[PDB]
Curated annotation (Swiss-Prot):
Reported modifications of this chain: Subject to ubiquitination and proteasomal degradation. Interaction with PLAGL2 or KAT5 enhances protein stability.
Subunit: Monomer and homodimer. Interacts with AR, MDM2, KAT5, PLAG1, PLAGL2, COPE, UBE2D2 and GORAB/NTKLBP1.
Organism from which the protein derives: Homo sapiens
Name this protein carries in UniProt: RING finger and CHY zinc finger domain-containing protein 1
Function: E3 ubiquitin-protein ligase that mediates ubiquitination of target proteins, including p53/TP53, TP73, HDAC1 and CDKN1B. Mediates ubiquitination and degradation of p53/TP53; preferentially acts on tetrameric p53/TP53. Catalyzes monoubiquitinates the translesion DNA polymerase POLH. Involved in the ribosome-associated quality control (RQC) pathway, which mediates the extraction of incompletely synthesized nascent chains from stalled ribosomes: RCHY1 acts downstream of NEMF and recognizes CAT tails associated with stalled nascent chains, leading to their ubiquitination and degradation.
Induction, as annotated: Up-regulated during the S phase of the cell cycle. Expressed at low levels during G phase.
Entry-annotated residues carrying Phosphoserine: 43
Localization (cell): Nucleus; Nucleus speckle; Cytoplasm
Length: 47
């Protein structure tokens, strides 16, 4: 019910899985080394 979209650090592919605190398995490479791909876009001017 709680699905979060996560992005991978090693195979760089995203998987929409449930939010699992004990480990969200990337189905692409069997790795738990993942970030969240639901990163919110904020508008800020930076030079
Ligand atoms: Zn992966």
């Amino acid at each position: 019910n709680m699905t979060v979209d996560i992005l991978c650090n090693d195979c760089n592919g995203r998987s929409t899985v449930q939010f699992h605190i004990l480990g969200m398995k990337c189905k692409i490479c069997e790795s738990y080394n993942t970030a969240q791909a639901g990163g919110r876009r904020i508008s800020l001017d930076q030079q």
